[PDB]
Amino acid sequence: MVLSEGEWQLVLHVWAKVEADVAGHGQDIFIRLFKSHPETLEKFDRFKHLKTEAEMKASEDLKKQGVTFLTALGAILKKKGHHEAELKPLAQSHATKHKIPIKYLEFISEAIIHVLHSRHPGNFGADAQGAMNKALELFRKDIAAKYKELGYQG
Residues in touch with ligand HEM (CB under 6 A): 40, 43-44, 46, 65, 68-69, 72-73, 90, 93-94, 98, 100, 104-105, 108
Instruction: Cite the DSSP H helix spans in the chain.
Output: 5-18, 22-36, 53-58, 60-78, 84-92, 102-119, 126-150
- Those residues whose C-beta lies under 8 Å from the C-beta of residue 21, and which sit 6 or more positions away, are none
**Looking at beta carbons only, is 96 or 118 nearer to ligand HEM?**
96
**Looking at beta carbons only, is 60 or 122 nearer to ligand HEM?**
60
Q: How far is the CB of 96 from ligand HEM (least distance, A)?
A: 10
Q: How far is the CB of 25 from ligand HEM (least distance, A)?
A: 13
| CA pair distance 67, 34, nearest whole angstrom | 16
